[PDB]
Amino acid sequence: DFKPFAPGYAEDPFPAIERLREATPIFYWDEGRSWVLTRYHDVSAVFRDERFAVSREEWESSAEYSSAIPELSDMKKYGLFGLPPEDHARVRKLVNPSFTSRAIDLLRAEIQRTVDQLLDARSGQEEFDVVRDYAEGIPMRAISALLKVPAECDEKFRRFGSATARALGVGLVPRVDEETKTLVASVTEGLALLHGVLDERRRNPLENDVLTMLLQAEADGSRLSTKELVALVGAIIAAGTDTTIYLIAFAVLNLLRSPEALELVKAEPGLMRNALDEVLRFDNILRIGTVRFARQDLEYCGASIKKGEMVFLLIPSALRDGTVFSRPDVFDVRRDTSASLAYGRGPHVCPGVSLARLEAEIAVGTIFRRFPEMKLKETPVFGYHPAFRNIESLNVILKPS
Ligand code: HEM
Numbered sequence: 001d002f003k004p005f006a007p008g009y010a011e012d013p014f015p016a017i018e019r020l021r022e023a024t025p026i027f028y029w030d031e032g033r034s035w036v037l038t039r040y041h042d043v044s045a046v047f048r049d050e051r052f053a054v055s056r057e058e059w060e061s062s063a064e065y066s067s068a069i070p071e072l073s074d075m076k077k078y079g080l081f082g083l084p085p086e087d088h089a090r091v092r093k094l095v096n097p098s099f100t101s102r103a104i105d106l107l108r109a110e111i112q113r114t115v116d117q118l119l120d121a122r123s124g125q126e127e128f129d130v131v132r133d134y135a136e137g138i139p140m141r142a143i144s145a146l147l148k149v150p151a152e153c154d155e156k157f158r159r160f161g162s163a164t165a166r167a168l169g170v171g172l173v174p175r176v177d178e179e180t181k182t183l184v185a186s187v188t189e190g191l192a193l194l195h196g197v198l199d200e201r202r203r204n205p206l207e208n209d210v211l212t213m214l215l216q217a218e219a220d221g222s223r224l225s226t227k228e229l230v231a232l233v234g235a236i237i238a239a240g241t242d243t244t245i246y247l248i249a250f251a252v253l254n255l256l257r258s259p260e261a262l263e264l265v266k267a268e269p270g271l272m273r274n275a276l277d278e279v280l281r282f283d284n285i286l287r288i289g290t291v292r293f294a295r296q297d298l299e300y301c302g303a304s305i306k307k308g309e310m311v312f313l314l315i316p317s318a319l320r321d322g323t324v325f326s327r328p329d330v331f332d333v334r335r336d337t338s339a340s341l342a343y344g345r346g347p348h349v350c351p352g353v354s355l356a357r358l359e360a361e362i363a364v365g366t367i368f369r370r371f372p373e374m375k376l377k378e379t380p381v382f383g384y385h386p387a388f389r390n391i392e393s394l395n396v397i398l399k400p401s
């Protein structure tokens with residue numbers, strides 16, 4: 001039984017996937033039209049198995065997929081998930097330096113400012129929603145600061161980011177939870193806006209600037225094409241928005257749920273970094289996981305997988321694998337989290353890992369330092385986002401009494 005859209009699954013998928021993981025390393029998911037890998041070692045292996053491709057054009061349903069949401073056709077083919085291996089490496093080699101911990105450190109001040117202003121704006125009420133009043137307003141500001149886009153454009157870009165991430169699932173994953181017209185509008189509006197931002201930066205290039213750097217790469221030799229560049233910036237916005245919102249929300253939730261964990265991070269603020277990694281290890285935000293496609297017929301974990309068939313890596317399951325993490329069903333902010341696959345492995349490893357950790361460190365660190373007695377008002381509400389165990393609301397009382 002695998003029903004990742006069943007009511008309750010997002011809130012707590014662990015009993016259901018544990019049953020799966022213990023019974024089998026692999027199964028075919030009817031509605032998902034793909035194989036599903038449940039165990040750490042098989043999941044981890046596939047990340048680094050060149051037999052399994054990332055490009056959706058290797059899928060048996062590629063035609064149906066490329067035709068869906070034609071406004072995103074360029075992003076699908078020239079984006080990081082679509083480029084051929086040689087081109088993918090080129091693009092990553094080009095942008096990776098811009099995302100190191102050192103490079104993104106400069107954003108520290110602006111992120112703190114945003115976090116400060118969100119807390120000042122709303123901390124006074126009876127009720128505070130860690131999603132809508134806090135987490136939701138942080139990640140795009142971070143990305144926009146990195147892109148040197150005015151705070152005025154934040155809301156429109158966040159809408160683009162969140163819409164794009166869902167739209168990319170249409171025809172690929174089972175149940176995208178929104179009206180197509182609305183999705184396409186936000187995507188169109190966002191791409192237009194992005195075009196304007198890029199044209200302006202071409203007009204006024206800047207020093208030590210990611211976009212300027214990309215634009216110069218595009219102008220000079222053959223290091224980056226216009227479509228690759230647009231697909232890259234679009235993907236950065238779409239990949240880095242909702243993911244980070246849920247990290248922040250899940251972090252606060254999990255620290256409210258473990259007084260012992262919270263107490264350790266209060267005692268040793270230096271543990272926050274490890275705690276945030278353990279949030280994704282213990283309670284991974286992905287509903288199912290990520291996908292790969294078989295480039296040829298092969299046998300795997302006792303299954304006969306055919307060329308072009310999709311495979312889902314069941315991340316929240318692999319990350320509860322007891323052969324890899326001891327006491328895997330315990331949230332332990334002191335554990336070694338090195339083996340967590342939350343940010344991927346191999347050439348496609350998430351470039352935003354440092355930016356995400358920084359944003360969450362500032363956001364989660366600040367809220368608990370400023371309101372150390374914060375308490376859950378009532379059970380968080382979860383939704384049916386096709387990719388995420390999305391928290392819709394996380395209502396708290398900042399200073400209870
Ligand atoms: C906040 C928590 C985040 C998580 C849990 C996360 C997770 C992941 C994972 C698992 C992958 C690999 C998917 C695969 O291999 O199929 C990935 C890739 C990617 N991530 Fe993140 N990410 C996060 C934040 C960010 C941020 C903040 C950005 C941008 C600022 C970002 C940009 C990207 C991009 C562009 C890719 C595609 C990489 C490639 O295919 O070469 N992510 N992310």
Ligand SMILES: C/C(=C\c1csc(C)n1)[C@@H]1C[C@@H]2O[C@]2(C)CCC[C@H](C)[C@H](O)[C@@H](C)C(=O)C(C)(C)[C@@H](O)CC(=O)O1
Pocket residue numbers: 075076079080081082164165166168169170172173235238239242243286289290291386387
């Ligand atoms: C938009 C995007 C990445 C990207 C880079 S280049 C390109 C095109 N897209 C982000 C990545 C994000 O870090 C994770 C969870 C990537 C999550 C990994 C996989 C790819 C997703 O869960 C996948 C099956 C999905 O459910 C959909 C709905 C298709 C995704 O949009 C979810 C989604 O939001 O994907």
